[PDB]
Amino acid sequence: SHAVKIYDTCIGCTLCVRACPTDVLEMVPASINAAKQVASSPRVEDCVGCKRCETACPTDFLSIRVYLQDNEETQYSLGLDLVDWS
Amino acid sequence: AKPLEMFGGVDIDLEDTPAHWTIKASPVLEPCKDNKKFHKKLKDELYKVKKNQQKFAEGSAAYARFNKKIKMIELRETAYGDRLCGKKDGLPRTIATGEWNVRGSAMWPAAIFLYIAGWIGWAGRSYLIRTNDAAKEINIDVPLAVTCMASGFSWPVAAWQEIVNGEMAVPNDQIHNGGPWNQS
Amino acid sequence: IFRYINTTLWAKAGHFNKALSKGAKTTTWIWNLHDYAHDFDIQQRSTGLIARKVFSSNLAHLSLVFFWISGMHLHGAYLSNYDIWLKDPKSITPSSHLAYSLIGQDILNSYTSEYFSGITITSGFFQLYRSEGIITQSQLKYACATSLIATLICLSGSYLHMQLMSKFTSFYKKFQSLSQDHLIIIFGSRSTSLSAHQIHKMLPANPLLDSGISKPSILQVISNSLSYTLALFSTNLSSTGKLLNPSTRSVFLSQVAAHHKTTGVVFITLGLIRFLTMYKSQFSILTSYIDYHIVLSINLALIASLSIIVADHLTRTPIYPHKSTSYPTILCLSIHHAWLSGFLIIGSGAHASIFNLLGSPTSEIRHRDPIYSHLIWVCIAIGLHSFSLYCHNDTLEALGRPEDIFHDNSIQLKAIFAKQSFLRAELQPDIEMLDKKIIRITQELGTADFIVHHIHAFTIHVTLLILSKGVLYARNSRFVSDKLELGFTYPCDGPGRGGTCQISPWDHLFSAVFWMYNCLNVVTFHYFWKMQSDVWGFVSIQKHISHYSQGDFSVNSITINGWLRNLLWSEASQVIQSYALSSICPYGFIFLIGHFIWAFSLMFLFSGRAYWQELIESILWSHHKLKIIPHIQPRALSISQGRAVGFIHYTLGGIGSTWAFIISRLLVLT
Amino acid sequence: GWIATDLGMRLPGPAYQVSTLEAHDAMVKFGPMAQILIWLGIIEVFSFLAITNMMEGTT
Amino acid sequence: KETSASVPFLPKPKNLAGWVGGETEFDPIGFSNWFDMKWLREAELKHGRVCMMATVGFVLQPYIGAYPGVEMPADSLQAVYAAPSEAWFAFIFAAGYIESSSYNGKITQLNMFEDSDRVPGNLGWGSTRLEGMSKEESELMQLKELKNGRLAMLAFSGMVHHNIVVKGALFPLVPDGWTGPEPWAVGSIMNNXXXXXXXX
Numbered sequence A: 001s002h003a004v005k006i007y008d009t010c011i012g013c014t015l016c017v018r019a020c021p022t023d024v025l026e027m028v029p030a031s032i033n034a035a036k037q038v039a040s041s042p043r044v045e046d047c048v049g050c051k052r053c054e055t056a057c058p059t060d061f062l063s064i065r066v067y068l069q070d071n072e073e074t075q076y077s078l079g080l081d082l083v084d085w086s
Numbered sequence B: 001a002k003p004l005e006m007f008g009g010v011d012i013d014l015e016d017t018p019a020h021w022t023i024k025a026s027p028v029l030e031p032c033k034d035n036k037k038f039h040k041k042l043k044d045e046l047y048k049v050k051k052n053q054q055k056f057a058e059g060s061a062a063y064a065r066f067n068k069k070i071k072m073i074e075l076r077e078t079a080y081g082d083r084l085c086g087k088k089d090g091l092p093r094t095i096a097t098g099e100w101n102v103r104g105s106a107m108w109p110a111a112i113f114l115y116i117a118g119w120i121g122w123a124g125r126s127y128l129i130r131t132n133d134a135a136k137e138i139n140i141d142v143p144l145a146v147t148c149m150a151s152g153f154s155w156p157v158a159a160w161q162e163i164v165n166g167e168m169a170v171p172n173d174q175i176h177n178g179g180p181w182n183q184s
Numbered sequence C: 001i002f003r004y005i006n007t008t009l010w011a012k013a014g015h016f017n018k019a020l021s022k023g024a025k026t027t028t029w030i031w032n033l034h035d036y037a038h039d040f041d042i043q044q045r046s047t048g049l050i051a052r053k054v055f056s057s058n059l060a061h062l063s064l065v066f067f068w069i070s071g072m073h074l075h076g077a078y079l080s081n082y083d084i085w086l087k088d089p090k091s092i093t094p095s096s097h098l099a100y101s102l103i104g105q106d107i108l109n110s111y112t113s114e115y116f117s118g119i120t121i122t123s124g125f126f127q128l129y130r131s132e133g134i135i136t137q138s139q140l141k142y143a144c145a146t147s148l149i150a151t152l153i154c155l156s157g158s159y160l161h162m163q164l165m166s167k168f169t170s171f172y173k174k175f176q177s178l179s180q181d182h183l184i185i186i187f188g189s190r191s192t193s194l195s196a197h198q199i200h201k202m203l204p205a206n207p208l209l210d211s212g213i214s215k216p217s218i219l220q221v222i223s224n225s226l227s228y229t230l231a232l233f234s235t236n237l238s239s240t241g242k243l244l245n246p247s248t249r250s251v252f253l254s255q256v257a258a259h260h261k262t263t264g265v266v267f268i269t270l271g272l273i274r275f276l277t278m279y280k281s282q283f284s285i286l287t288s289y290i291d292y293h294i295v296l297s298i299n300l301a302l303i304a305s306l307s308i309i310v311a312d313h314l315t316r317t318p319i320y321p322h323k324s325t326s327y328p329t330i331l332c333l334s335i336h337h338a339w340l341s342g343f344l345i346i347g348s349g350a351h352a353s354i355f356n357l358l359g360s361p362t363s364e365i366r367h368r369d370p371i372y373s374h375l376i377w378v379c380i381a382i383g384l385h386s387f388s389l390y391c392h393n394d395t396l397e398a399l400g401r402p403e404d405i406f407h408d409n410s411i412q413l414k415a416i417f418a419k420q421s422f423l424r425a426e427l428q429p430d431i432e433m434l435d436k437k438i439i440r441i442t443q444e445l446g447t448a449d450f451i452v453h454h455i456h457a458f459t460i461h462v463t464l465l466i467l468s469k470g471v472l473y474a475r476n477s478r479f480v481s482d483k484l485e486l487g488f489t490y491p492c493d494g495p496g497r498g499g500t501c502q503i504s505p506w507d508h509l510f511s512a513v514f515w516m517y518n519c520l521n522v523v524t525f526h527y528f529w530k531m532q533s534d535v536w537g538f539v540s541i542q543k544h545i546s547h548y549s550q551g552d553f554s555v556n557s558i559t560i561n562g563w564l565r566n567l568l569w570s571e572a573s574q575v576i577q578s579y580a581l582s583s584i585c586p587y588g589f590i591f592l593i594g595h596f597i598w599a600f601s602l603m604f605l606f607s608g609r610a611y612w613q614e615l616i617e618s619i620l621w622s623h624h625k626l627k628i629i630p631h632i633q634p635r636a637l638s639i640s641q642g643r644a645v646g647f648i649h650y651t652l653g654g655i656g657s658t659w660a661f662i663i664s665r666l667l668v669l670t
Numbered sequence D: 001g002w003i004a005t006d007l008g009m010r011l012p013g014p015a016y017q018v019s020t021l022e023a024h025d026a027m028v029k030f031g032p033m034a035q036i037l038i039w040l041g042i043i044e045v046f047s048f049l050a051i052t053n054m055m056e057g058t059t
Numbered sequence E: 001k002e003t004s005a006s007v008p009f010l011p012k013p014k015n016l017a018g019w020v021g022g023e024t025e026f027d028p029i030g031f032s033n034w035f036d037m038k039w040l041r042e043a044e045l046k047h048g049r050v051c052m053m054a055t056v057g058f059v060l061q062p063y064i065g066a067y068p069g070v071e072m073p074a075d076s077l078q079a080v081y082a083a084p085s086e087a088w089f090a091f092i093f094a095a096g097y098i099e100s101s102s103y104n105g106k107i108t109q110l111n112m113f114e115d116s117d118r119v120p121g122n123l124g125w126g127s128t129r130l131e132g133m134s135k136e137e138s139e140l141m142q143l144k145e146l147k148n149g150r151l152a153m154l155a156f157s158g159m160v161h162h163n164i165v166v167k168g169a170l171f172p173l174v175p176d177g178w179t180g181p182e183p184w185a186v187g188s189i190m191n192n193x194x195x196x197x198x199x200x
């Protein structure tokens, strides 16, 4: 599994949530921006690592950062279809 | 004790006088007009071109063009006579010692190119400074562009006057230094 | 109507695409502007504009081809030794191409005739002119004039159709009308027109030249007025192709005229048949393939296949007079059409992928795994078999065990079907020769021919694997389930799932171009070595044959070292030792430049754009230091563009290397 | 010009002792046709300016 | 919409107010509308003056040249090579000094008229012999200067090209056995096709 971290610079775009192809991200209420909402990654075990969330993030440097961990890959982080690891 | 054999063929000047600092005193080189390899090479050029010429008709245009080529080759032979060539190749050399007063010296082309290259760079920089917009880089303001192009001739003086007066460089704290290397 | 044809958009670059309307903020904007220039589908406005753009651009390109033809005709009339070539084609190399005497470039022109010096052309235009009964300079003048008039007409038509066609325009969608009129009026009614042209201008002329009257009484006989010669004057019974014309070393032009007449009749009858014939099975294909990209792909594949048929049929089915002996011309005519076949096949695959992404695919995409899997297995099988017979021969020859290799004098793999394929030609049991030169002798196919044909099959199958894998896995895949939303061309989907680089159909074309290039480089080498070794060459009066390569193919082409030594090294002596030699200086220089360009491509092929972006930023620091700010911000090439540039330079450099290598050698030997 | 040349009117130079048919080629090879083309080129540049400024309504 | 007095079929060039040729406004291409016409006037005046001096020197050299010790080529074009390098160096040095000092170092189309917008073509040299005409015949004097400058420019061009077509001196106009000019010995594509150099 990868590591998807959300930083304080988030401005509640919701673009990262919409771009995620495996429903890793979600919007949670907060009080650090005018949108009163920040992103969260409660399900990074389903994060394939496509980094579309990083493409969609418009902050100066990404408020959402995906750290690839190749020696950590699970069946969900690899998108295995022909083969089951469970 | 024969420095040629001591050093495996290469020969050393063995003399410490300022008169040998010129390239013309080198024993590797020799004036082209009295070098055997130069004579042989340009004679072979003449022979090959002449042999090609005889293959065509006498009254054809190709014959006249080959005569013109032969004249060009002979003019090249007589023009490179004062140029220095090695005592073993016959190919004339280019002098890159800053001599300023020898045939084939690299000082004159260097000066000419540096002037015109500074001219080009100065014209481009002036246009970029006077058009601080992206729209002016895709749709060139041709009158202003040619104005800067003509104005670039005084670059060796204007550029220095900007260097000393603090109008060329910019302090590092005003442009993006680069990627962060620390924070924690 | 035409009041809207305004220049106001000429200054406004990038107007056609709404993604470029934000302005040139970065240098990526320039490359995107060039990339979307001909992508009429994604450009602004309705579908009618797409049709107008496509049709008018077709007309403009047709005008461009006509202009190229006109240039060739004017070069032949005013910058050529076509006169002396007409008088004596066996002693004069064709040349309609001079070089100015600048920077010593005069060394490029070589002796072609006693009154002419120039670059030996290998386009075969002189043979075409002679087969077209063109003798006087006035005929070439008027051919050039007609081609220029056609250029102007097609340019004006392209200009007009951008406003003649409207939103209601529908003539392009009438596929029944297009097929019927094309077939009948062009393939039938123009083939018979060319048959008429030949019967009335070639047979009156080409037999006169072959009859030894190159004089032809000037215009007294050559300018038609020869209705006392009969159409089938010198058919000499026999069968078309069994007996060649002994003078010009080609099929008699009367037989060619009869061929064109009969083919026109056949096409007209097929157009009549199409009123009631076999249908209702290709009907799903009929309804599902009415789109620009699908018909473009179909036409590209068809034209490329026709190009390869032309490449194989222009060499040992000699049609043109005095062309079989002109070995550089034969080589060029084969190899150029081979390369065009490969390139247009690749384009057909690309546009199949584009159609799949824009339109809706057909039934074959649902069992795509068995298809693209048995294709994988067959590619592996014929790669581990065809090539390795070369590796086996190489290893056992290096070991000193020649009796264990695959050769004719050893374990031999007989080409059973080809050896039993004496159906083609079926000529008499001897050879044909014109003047110290072999016209055509039957290629005796042995073990080496078997192995190299299997190499060809393997390379073709791998290129097809890449193309069909790109086409079938365009919409979605087990790897990425929404490839349709990603578009046609994309760098990747991200480093996730292990890595998703080069999943797009565009990247599949990117690999397929490399594999097609590798596929027909072997085809070029097989042809270039086989013809020299076993067909082309001198002769001896005692019926003995001395070929150019002295029969190296059957003894050396069984091992990779044989290809390296006897083809890429021994036969490269002409190009490598081509400096200061009048005709072949540019070929040596272009050999060097092709090596440089091919190696230069590797910088784009092996590297990623992030390193170059960081380097560009480092340089931009120095630029900003001296108050030199490019407001079109410098960005490195996009990933797809980096791959495209790498592929283009790779193929261009390699093609130039082969081009120089083959052409210089054939010019020296001839 | 054709009338005058055919009827025998010529410039006082032996280089002009040609028929009217060969006058064009002979004078092209002689030089004056190139100079005439240069002069007609400048006059036609002025004419082109006239057309451009008339069609646009500037004059 | 007025028209120019010189070319009546063209629009009257704006930005060409009265400087000299205000009666015959002549700018078909329209450089005055494209460039700072004060710089254009400065360039025209410098060209005219340099060409007056050039015509006088070009005429004088074959006859009353011959500075004591300098060699004499009849063809005034060759006088550059057949002259002492020292005198030529000193002359170019003086010309550069005059060019640099006259404009106070603002010798640049961008910086020529930026703060010292004095007057187009005025250098304060010999102005004591002007302005006594009550600003009316002074304009006529400026007109005469401009007309002489333009005539001198065209005349010097003609003299150079006459010396080239003759390949000799200048004043022996139409020398003996010259029989007309055909001296441009440079090949051309039209020349190549006409002379049958290519083809055949």
Ligand code: CLA
Binding pocket: C034, C035, C036, C037, C038, C039, C040, C296, C300, C343, C344, C346, C347, C348, C350, C354, C488, C489, C506, C509, C513, C648, C652
């Ligand atoms: C009839 C032939 C034909 C036609 C009409 C089209 C038409 C189209 N193609 Mg296409 N294609 C073709 C053949 C054709 N192609 C072939 C044979 C191939 C295989 C190589 C391809 C591969 C291909 C790809 C991979 C893509 C297209 C795309 C497109 C679309 C936009 C093209 C564009 O804007 O490029 C603008 C034009 C250029 C950028 C031309 C630049 C010059 C090229 C790239 C380099 C050539 C180098 C030159 C030969 C050597 C130089 C000489 C040297 C000495 C200096 C358009 C629908 C693109 C698309 O999005 O489709 C919807 C796309 O991604 N095509």
Ligand SMILES: CC(=O)O[C@H]1CC(C)(C)C(=C=C/C(C)=C/C=C/C(C)=C/C=C/C=C(C)/C=C/C=C(C)/C=C/[C@@]23O[C@]2(C)C[C@@H](O)CC3(C)C)[C@](C)(O)C1
Binding pocket: E052, E053, E055, E056, E125, E126, E127, E129, E148, E151, E152, E155, E156, E158, E159, E162, E170, E171, E173
């Ligand atoms: C102390 C102080 O302050 O200084 C004062 C001093 C003073 C005197 C008061 C001043 C002044 C005025 C000056 C210096 C005025 C000089 C004016 C000159 C030299 C004019 C030359 C014109 C040449 C022409 C038209 C050539 C024409 C040539 C032609 C037409 C040639 C015509 C030919 O056909 C002819 C004749 C022959 C053929 O070969 C072809 C060619 C040569 C072309 C100042 C400026 O105020 C400053």
Ligand SMILES: CC1=C(C/C=C(\C)CCC[C@H](C)CCC[C@H](C)CCCC(C)C)C(=O)c2ccccc2C1=O
Binding pocket: C603, C604, C605, C607, C608, C609, C612, C613, C635, C636, C637, C638, C639, C641, C642, C643
């Ligand atoms: C070198 C390189 C660059 C940098 C190269 C760039 C930006 C090319 C653009 C440079 C200029 C604009 C090209 C213009 C042409 C040349 C200046 C001259 C070519 C012709 C000469 C022979 C005269 C990338 O951006 C890149 C991106 C992705 C994968 C690989 C690479 C890559 O390899």
Ligand code: SF4
Binding pocket: A006, A009, A010, A011, A012, A013, A014, A015, A016, A017, A038, A039, A053, A056, A057, A058, A059, A062, A063, A064
């Ligand atoms: S895209 Fe970036 S800034 Fe926007 S909500 Fe997601 S993490 Fe926050």
Ligand code: SF4
Binding pocket: A004, A019, A020, A021, A022, A023, A024, A025, A046, A047, A048, A049, A050, A051, A052, A053, A054, A066, C496
């Ligand atoms: S890398 Fe892809 S899967 Fe993972 S959180 Fe980002 S968008 Fe979702």
Ligand code: SF4
Binding pocket: C491, C492, C493, C494, C495, C496, C499, C500, C501, C502, C608, C639
């Ligand atoms: S290396 Fe390049 S192509 Fe591969 S996943 Fe990363 S960005 Fe995409």
